[PDB]
Amino acid sequence: SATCHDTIDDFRNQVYSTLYSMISVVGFFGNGFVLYVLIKTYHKKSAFQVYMINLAVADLLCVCTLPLRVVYYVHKGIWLFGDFLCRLSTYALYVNLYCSIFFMTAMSFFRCIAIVFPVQNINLVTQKKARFVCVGIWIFVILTSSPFLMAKPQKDEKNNTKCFEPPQDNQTKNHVLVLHYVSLFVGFIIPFVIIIVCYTMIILTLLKKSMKSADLEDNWETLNDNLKVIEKADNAAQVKDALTKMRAAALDAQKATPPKLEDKSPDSPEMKDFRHGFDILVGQIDDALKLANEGKVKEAQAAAEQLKTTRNAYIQKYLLSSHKKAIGMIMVVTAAFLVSFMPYHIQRTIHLHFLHNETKPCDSVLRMQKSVVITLSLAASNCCFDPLLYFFSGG
Ligand SMILES: O=C(Nc1cccc2c(=O)cc(-c3nnn[nH]3)oc12)c1ccc(OCCCCc2ccccc2)cc1
Ligand SMILES: CCCCCCCC/C=C\CCCCCCCC(=O)OC[C@H](O)CO
Numbered sequence: 001s002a003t004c005h006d007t008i009d010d011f012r013n014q015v016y017s018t019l020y021s022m023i024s025v026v027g028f029f030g031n032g033f034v035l036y037v038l039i040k041t042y043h044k045k046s047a048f049q050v051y052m053i054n055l056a057v058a059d060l061l062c063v064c065t066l067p068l069r070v071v072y073y074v075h076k077g078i079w080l081f082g083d084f085l086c087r088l089s090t091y092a093l094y095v096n097l098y099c100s101i102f103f104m105t106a107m108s109f110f111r112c113i114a115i116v117f118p119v120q121n122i123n124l125v126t127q128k129k130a131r132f133v134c135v136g137i138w139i140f141v142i143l144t145s146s147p148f149l150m151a152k153p154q155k156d157e158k159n160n161t162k163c164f165e166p167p168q169d170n171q172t173k174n175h176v177l178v179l180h181y182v183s184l185f186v187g188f189i190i191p192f193v194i195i196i197v198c199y200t201m202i203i204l205t206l207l208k209k210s211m212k213s214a215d216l217e218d219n220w221e222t223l224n225d226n227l228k229v230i231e232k233a234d235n236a237a238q239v240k241d242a243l244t245k246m247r248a249a250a251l252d253a254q255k256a257t258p259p260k261l262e263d264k265s266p267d268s269p270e271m272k273d274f275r276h277g278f279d280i281l282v283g284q285i286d287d288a289l290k291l292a293n294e295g296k297v298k299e300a301q302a303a304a305e306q307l308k309t310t311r312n313a314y315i316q317k318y319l320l321s322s323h324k325k326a327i328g329m330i331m332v333v334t335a336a337f338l339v340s341f342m343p344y345h346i347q348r349t350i351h352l353h354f355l356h357n358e359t360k361p362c363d364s365v366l367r368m369q370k371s372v373v374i375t376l377s378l379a380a381s382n383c384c385f386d387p388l389l390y391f392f393s394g395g
């Protein structure tokens with residue numbers, strides 16, 4: 001099988017060396033810039049900022065171990081470093097991968113509560129709660145990825161020191177299969193379901209809030225448009241027609257919530273004054289109608305300008321960015337889950353089932369060894385997804 005192994009080795013060494021090199025550069029210069037900004041911007045403390053520091057740290061710790069993988073594949077697949085470094089480099093990539101998944105999961109759940117429940121949400125109170133979730137993730141990942149720090153050393157047919165190889169003996173094949181099933185369910189399927197559930201709730205909340213904001217702008221546009229009709233009208237019939245259209249628009253806008261009061265309680269003084277503003281405006285429309293019905297067409301135009309002062313002193317101060325930053329967070333994490341994490345966990349499942357099988361011909365082994373090169377490189381590319389999270393989300 002010496003000819004069979006060397007065939008895939010040509011692809012394996014070329015692709016891994018080229019991809020890990022750019023992933024090391026883009027990862028270091030990307031996350032390094034992200035961490036530099038977050039440290040300088042200490043005055044503005046957010047739950048999103050807590051997850052961004054932790055994501056960059058987990059990436060920097062991984063990109064520092066990635067050039068050791070470059071040296072390995074450049075040197076025709078021979079490990080020039082120590083046995084501990086082979087164990088630590090393999091450990092670092094898994095730690096980073098599952099830290100990234102759990103941090104992006106917790107970030108999605110914390111943003112979901114901030115969007116669905118904006119009244120009970122407190123920016124600095126959730127920040128302290130996010131710090132406890134981060135250490136809870138770190139302690140879990142470090143202790144669960146520990147069997148790889150005490151793993152058996154990998155050797156070739158000519159006793160050559162090898163690294164990042166599939167399990168050799170049947171005992172190691174069993175020890176990693178037990179870890180695979182746990183890390184597939186707890187470390188991928190469940191956090192993926194959480195992201196699918198969280199994002200369904202977020203888009204639904206935003207789709208409703210944007211629609212209600214569109215109706216509020218439509219009612220305020222007609223209120224200003226019909227006010228221009230009254231001053232331009234010559235007869236009372238045109239004035240009375242616009243006032244009935246204005247009264248209907250003023251009642252609709254009174255029920256709807258403005259974007260500046262999304263974080264405020266429906267019984268708060270801010271929401272009570274907004275409703276009271278339209279209560280005076282409706283009364284002023286009816287007072288103008290009472291004069292328009294009397295035949296006083298000119299005198300009704302003065303009352304239409306009298307309610308314009310009420311609009312400026314009660315409804316103007318109430319009539320955002322949170323929607324844009326949430327949408328950006330959805331895209332980046334979804335792209336990271338479909339490109340980085342999903343092909344890795346899919347291929348790994350197919351790979352371990354193949355290794356346990358008795359019949360394994362050269363052509364079939366060639367596909368599995370080529371597929372893992374692609375998926376593991378994409379799994380390692382998760383460090384390139386996090387700098388984009390800063391640029392497209394949470395300010
Ligand atoms: O079977 C595995 N890998 C594998 C199979 C077949 C072939 C190969 C292969 O050719 C090359 C590599 C390789 N991995 N890195 N570099 N090269 O790996 C292979 C494998 C199993 C488990 C695992 O991590 C589980 C612990 C994570 C912590 C965790 C625990 C509980 C909940 C959540 C999180 C990781 C890899
Ligand atoms: C936030 C996440 C909380 C969710 C927590 C839920 C607990 C997960 C329970 C079971 C997962 C299934 C993994 C079972 C792995 C058993 C290993 C095994 O023995 O199976 C291999 C078999 O022996 C060889 O064919």
Ligand code: NA
Pocket residue numbers: 055059096100382383384386
């Ligand atoms: Na990451």
